[PDB]
Write a protein that binds this ligand. Structure first.
Ligand SMILES: CC(=O)N[C@@H]1[C@@H](O)[C@H](O[C@@H]2O[C@H](CO)[C@@H](O[C@@H]3O[C@H](CO)[C@@H](O)[C@H](O)[C@H]3NC(C)=O)[C@H](O)[C@H]2NC(C)=O)[C@@H](CO)O[C@H]1O
Length: 273
């Protein structure tokens, strides 16, 4: 399969064009539209890469076009660890789907934040806030595919099955790629020597949800998460031999481009995925 990567949360990690030109990733999730819902004006946060006021982040459409011409899929990730995002009602789900359509996908807005490129879909990295209406947000975004171009739906649930924020949304069957985060969660992640908490968790997910492909989400360096790091040699010798048997295996997802560069994790595992 391929490597999905999160880009956008450290200004020293290189441009989106530098990231796609690496030829290591097949999917890039742009990290974070971290404020929306509840009448808030939506705001994208891309750390030190650019300030979105007055179209500062509009240069990012160059990197999106570059990645797409190389067949890389590019999603805008909603959520993240830090932010006031929430949906207050089903009406709010409609209003947010609307904004996302016109500002990031095929609708139209004078003020598109990342510029004129049309992203491939929306990633759900919902970690806190309401557990409600995310299934409605996924339905309203799917319905836009009926106006000709396909909107991809991905989700990054953390590994406790079911995810309290994303379980109802995952049960619709509308998601294309699900990259389960097997880190910062001791009961389902790797701890030295023990591979059975992560494999056993992998089994609950690949047999329970109705989705296109499931990926093994990992931290790219011991510094990228509080816990959950797996050394390259353990991943390749002990975990991937078992999870690649699954027909739903899609590949591996890595939290952050930034850490991946410092640690050379992709460079170590790219042919085994
Ligand atoms: C271990 C890990 O990856 N943790 C992630 C957090 O880093 C991340 O929060 C973001 O942190 C970065 C780095 O401190 C923030 O970037 C700074 O942003 C300001 C403007 O907001 C900018 O002036 C700084 O230059 C920029 N620093 C750099 C090096 O680019 C960024 O604002 C934080 N993001 C948010 C939403 O607040 C969070 C995000 O959820 O994820 C952690 O996992």
């Amino acid at each position: 399969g391929g490597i999905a990567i999160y880009w956008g949360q450290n200004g020293n990690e290189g441009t989106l064009t530098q990231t796609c030109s690496t030829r290591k990733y097949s999917y890039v999730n742009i990290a974070f539209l971290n404020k929306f819902g509840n009448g808030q004006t939506p705001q994208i946060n891309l750390a030190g890469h650019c300030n979105p006021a007055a179209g500062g982040c509009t240069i990012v459409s160059n990197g999106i076009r570059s990645c797409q011409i190389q067949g890389i899929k590019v999603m805008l990730s909603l959520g993240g660890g830090i932010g006031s995002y929430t949906l207050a009602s089903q009406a709010d789900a409609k209003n947010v789907a609307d904004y996302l359509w016109n500002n990031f996908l095929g609708g139209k807005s004078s003020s598109r934040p990342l510029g004129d490129a049309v992203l491939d879909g929306i990633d759900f990295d919902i970690e806190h806030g309401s557990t409600l209406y995310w299934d409605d947000l996924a339905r309203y975004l799917s319905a836009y595919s009926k106006q000709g171009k396909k909107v991809y739906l991905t989700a990054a649930p953390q590994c406790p099955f079911p995810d309290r924020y994303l379980g109802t949304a995952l049960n619709t069957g509308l998601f294309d790629y699900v990259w389960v985060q097997f880190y910062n969660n001791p009961p389902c992640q790797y701890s030295s020597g023990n591979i059975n908490n992560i494999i056993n968790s992998w089994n609950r997910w690949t047999t329970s949800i109705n989705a296109g492909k499931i990926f093994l989400g990992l931290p790219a360096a011991p510094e990228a998460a509080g816990s959950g790091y797996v050394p390259p040699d353990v991943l390749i010798s002990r975990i991937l031999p078992e999870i690649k048997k699954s027909p739903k295996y899609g590949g591996v997802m890595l939290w952050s481009k930034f850490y991946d560069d410092k640690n050379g994790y992709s460079s170590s595992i790219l042919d085994s995925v």
